[PDB]
Each structure stands twice: as structure tokens, then as C-alpha cells.
Amino acid sequence: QRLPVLPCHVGDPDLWFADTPAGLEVAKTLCVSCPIRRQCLAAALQRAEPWGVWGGEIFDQGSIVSHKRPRGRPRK
DNA sequence: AGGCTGGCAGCAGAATAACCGGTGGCAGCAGCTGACCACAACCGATTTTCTGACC
Numbered sequence A: 001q002r003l004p005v006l007p008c009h010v011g012d013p014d015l016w017f018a019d020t021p022a023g024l025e026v027a028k029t030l031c032v033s034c035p036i037r038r039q040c041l042a043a044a045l046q047r048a049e050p051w052g053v054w055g056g057e058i059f060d061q062g063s064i065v066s067h068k069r070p071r072g073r074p075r076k
Numbered sequence B: 001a002g003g004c005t006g007g008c009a010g011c012a013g014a015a016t017a018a019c020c021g022g023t024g025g026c027a028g029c030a031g032c033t034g035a036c037c038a039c040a041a042c043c044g045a046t047t048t049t050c051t052g053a054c055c
Ligand code: SF4
Pocket: A007, A008, A009, A030, A031, A032, A034, A035, A036, A037, A038, A040, A041, A053, A054, A055, A056, A057
């Protein structure tokens, strides 16, 4: 079916929870071409997923952050 | 004098209406819990790593 075209499970699944701001960036933008962004993002927002890339967007424990804040002192 | 030998005959089996007492089960439910999620916050370093000034 359309399973190998689905960009979620094409490669290694441990990529999409890597705890670097730059590592998961290609994981987030790899769901640009995903055919099911609407329903996946809708399910992720309704069930309140606390981790990882969902619907081509990252998640905190309840909501969506724009980009994950890096380790260290943030920029003034 | 009967007996035990002989067929002869006959048969089983197989195939193709109430009471009373008591006693234990049981289900329903307030009412101690008491362990348990469970959010939800709040801190305890921890490490990085800028940020800010020092001379
Ligand atoms: S997170 Fe995005 S890319 Fe991955 S399966 Fe869901 S919609 Fe597709």
C-alpha cells in the first residue's frame, strides 16, 4: 500500500526523539511530504502527547513549541 | 429295574397440597479505610555556557 511512502516509519524510529535541537530538525521537516499530516497532527493535539515529533511539529508535555531550546545560557 | 446314548426338538444370539422452623447464602450499601494513581507543583543538583564586569 502507501506504507513505504509514509515518512514516519521510513527509517530508524529512534531518530525522532533525539534530544538535540538540530538532530530532530530534519525529522520535523521530513514530514513536510507526509500525506497524513492533518489526522496525525489532530490525533497528537487531542490526546496530548508529551514527546517527540508529531505531525511535522515538536511537542512539549502539552503543547507545541516552535524550536526546542538548547542546553546552555539562552541568547540575550 | 433304571441309565446314558442317540437323534429330535426348541431356543439364544449375530449380520445384513399446603404450614412452620431454622439456617446459611447473598446482594446492597454506608463506612472505616488504605494503598494508589495522579496531576501538579516544587525543588536539588547538574552541566553548559553565555553574561557581566575586572585591570
Ligand atoms: S508525525 Fe508527521 S510524518 Fe510522522 S506519521 Fe505523523 S503525520 Fe506522518
